[PDB]
Amino acid sequence: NPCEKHSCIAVIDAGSTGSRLHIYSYDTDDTNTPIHIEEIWNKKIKPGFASIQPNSVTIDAYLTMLLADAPIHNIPVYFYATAGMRLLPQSQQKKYYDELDYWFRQQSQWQLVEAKTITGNDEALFDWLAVNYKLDTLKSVQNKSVGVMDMGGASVQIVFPMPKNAEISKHNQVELNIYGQNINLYVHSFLGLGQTEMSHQFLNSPSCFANDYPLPDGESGQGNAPSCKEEVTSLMNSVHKVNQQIQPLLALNPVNEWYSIGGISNLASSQLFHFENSELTNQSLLQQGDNQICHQQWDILNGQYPDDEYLYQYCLLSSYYYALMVDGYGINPNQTIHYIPPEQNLDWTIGVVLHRALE
Amino acid sequence: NPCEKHSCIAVIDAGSTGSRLHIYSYDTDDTNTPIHIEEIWNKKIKPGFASIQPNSVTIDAYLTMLLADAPIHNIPVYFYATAGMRLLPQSQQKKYYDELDYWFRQQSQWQLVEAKTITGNDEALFDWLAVNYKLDTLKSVQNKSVGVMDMGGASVQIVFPMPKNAEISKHNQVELNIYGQNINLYVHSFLGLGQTEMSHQFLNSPSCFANDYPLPDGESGQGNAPSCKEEVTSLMNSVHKVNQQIQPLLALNPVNEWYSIGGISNLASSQLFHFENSELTNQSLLQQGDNQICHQQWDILNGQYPDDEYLYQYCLLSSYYYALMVDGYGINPNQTIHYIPPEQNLDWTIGVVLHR
Ligand SMILES: [Cl-]
Ligand SMILES: [Cl-]
Questions:
Q1: Do A82 and A127 belong together in one domain?
Q2: Which of A217, A305, A319, A320 has the most B C-beta neighbours within 10 Å, making it the best mutation to test the interface with B?
Q3: Nearest ligand (C-alpha, residue B192)
Q4: Where does this protein hold Mg(2+) 2 (chain B) (predicted)?
Q5: Which range of residues forms the domain containing residue A323?
């Protein structure tokens, strides 16, 4: 038991399709920042916390199931819900936290520090911290601007270095002091551009599905990644104005290197795709998606990759990631995007180890 | 027990936000078509069926919560799911039906006749039938065109009279016979344009919420219904193409009387709005939404109307209904829109009684 000799905390990522408990051990350096962060337990249950009934019987069973079988007890716990909960009226969110806080108060082997819905901005901050901890770029001043994108189930985040600026909302900027240095980041998140929210507007678009895929309106897929990508661009830009919001900032604050986590890692490392060195370009992503998925017959594809649960959306997702990065964020279609290998299955929770404040 | 003296049927509308069980008694006329339809039981539960974990304990508990206290069990059941399920691929929907079928194989009072996800087009037909049955316009050849809109949580339906049309997907029209008259309807369902799904595109848009309402990203609302409405219009027309599909057909087949069911009734009959005779116009809906929610200080307005979980959405919803009906369907902003009083809890299920 490492928690007898090292600091440990638990961080629960309560996301849209489940809740994932992580337990991290670590030490602290002379700037009192965490170092030697190690994950010693990782367990996910379904479904998403915001999707269960907010009553004591249900929440109690859910929390019990999540915290069952934990090898370590008697540590602090941070329960951070993200977009799944952000989608609910705040008076509904309150019932959940009331019930969960109550559950924690009537037991004494987990010490609940905080249970709340974090903003997409806090979540972007954590995204940027987790990736840069892994790349070991936090301890020393960086010459290169590292940008991070999180392609999540229920929101997407973008975050990159930017100097303190009086003309951008203060909720989109974070200044942090970590390892002795000051880092100033622009943070942004989008709910309606999450994969779930975005997909629910295109399920009847034939260009976004493999040929003969049955669309819910009774028509057939006729997959065409560029056509699908143009349609998704209308959501990005005519509706959400991502281009107007994000392209001026990246032009004034260039990113030297892009890293991504979330669904993009999962799609890119699927056997339908061929990428080396855990990196892709948007150009290649769209072309591969169009050739490998959009232009194939659904039943053949489905038969060839069984129990591959988001397969039916791969044509749409290829197109949507392009539309988001290139048409929305303005990123060159030939620029390299690093993705964190999906085996490490990284989420933003390491950022909570590193940074315990919120907005 | 009214089912001793009359035919009865149970019809569940398993929509995106909840399922509503209705039990209807009825007699029939000389064609064996239902008449004298009365509702004898109405129970709603939440959340939507398609949103619960598809394992057997969760599905069985939900069906029990829906059906077990019903006062009559030995009757035909039609379980029709709609847009909540349309959001899921067929392999996921199958899991839900397999468990559901099993639960019915165990409760052998109920006679499950069908449990399936219906098409948006069948749903729209049901919408039109249910509303016209209640208005009593079915028994005779109407000299006016009655249109119906169903403002659901995940999809929205529009349906109105239109003669056969070689230029229109036959997915979008239906001929029906009822009470011995033929009627052709145009039908259309727009998936993702229901109020819940659509609201998930706008929760951080300051134009769509009361001044200083705290948005999920930490920003403040800065309500302005024309700005909100325009954003919603981009979803309707840049993304979904509603105007291009619907406006030319209403131009050629005008509707004299629009009726609506679903969320518009709940919004319009709330205490924030002032409408008489269960009808509104879009122009009045937008202006009242704009003046009495969008342009209000949130904390003050919230303290003024305490009893009201959805109040904070009224800026967005007023702007949305306007975008849909006026910018999407092309309805004159001054044309009366009748909405069914919310206390009737009218959905499309009367249509199942009538057409199966
Ligand atoms: Cl549909
Ligand atoms: Cl947010």
A1: no
A2: A217
A3: 1
A4: 104, 107, 110
A5: 119-346
